[PDB]
C-alpha cells in the first residue's frame, strides 16, 4: 500500500516461527519494542496486526 | 469504641502492610509490575534496564 | 581478536547482540571491555 491508505492484515489462529523472520537478513533492520526478537518464539499473543 | 488505641495499632499495621503489598503492582516506569513478564519478554541487556 | 566479515553483519560485533556470526562464529561477552574497529576493505578482500 501507499502510506496514505496504509494496509492492515490481522494474523490469527496460527503458529509463528519468528526465528525464520529474524534470520532472513534481506530485512535491513528489525527493531522491537516491549519484546526482544529472540523471545518472540517463546511468547503467545491475543491478536497480531501487520 | 473503648479499645480505640489497641484497635488503631492493628489497623495502622494492616494499612502499612497492605500498602507495602500493593506497591508490588506499581510500574515505577518499567514495562510491567510483574517481574516474570520482563524476564520472559526481553534479552538480559534490555531486561536489566 | 581479528577476522573478515560481511559489512551488514558488523552490527553483531557488540556485547549481547543476536545473529549467526555472534551466535556460532565469534561471540562477545555480555559485559565486554574493549574497542571494536572495522572498515569496508572491498579494495583488498574482494575477488569474485
From Swiss-Prot, chain B:
Changing residue 40 to A: In strain: Alpha/B.1.1.7. Changing residue 8 to N: In strain: Delta/B.1.617.2, Mu/B.1.621. Residues 7-49 form a coiled coil. Changing residue 12 to H: In strain: Omicron/BA.1, Omicron/BA.2, Omicron/BA.2.12.1, Omicron/BA.2.75, Omicron/BA.4, Omicron/BA.5, Omicron/BQ.1.1, Omicron/XBB.1.5, Omicron/EG.5.1. Subunit of the fusion protein that is processed upon entry into the host cell. Mediates fusion of the virion and cellular membranes by functioning as a class I viral fusion protein. Contains a viral fusion peptide that is unmasked after S2 cleavage. This cleavage can occur at the cell membrane by host TMPRSS2 or during endocytosis by host CSTL. In either case, this triggers an extensive and irreversible conformational change that leads to fusion of the viral envelope with the cellular cytoplasmic membrane, releasing viral genomic RNA into the host cell cytoplasm. This is Spike protein S2'. It comes from Severe acute respiratory syndrome coronavirus 2. The gene is S.
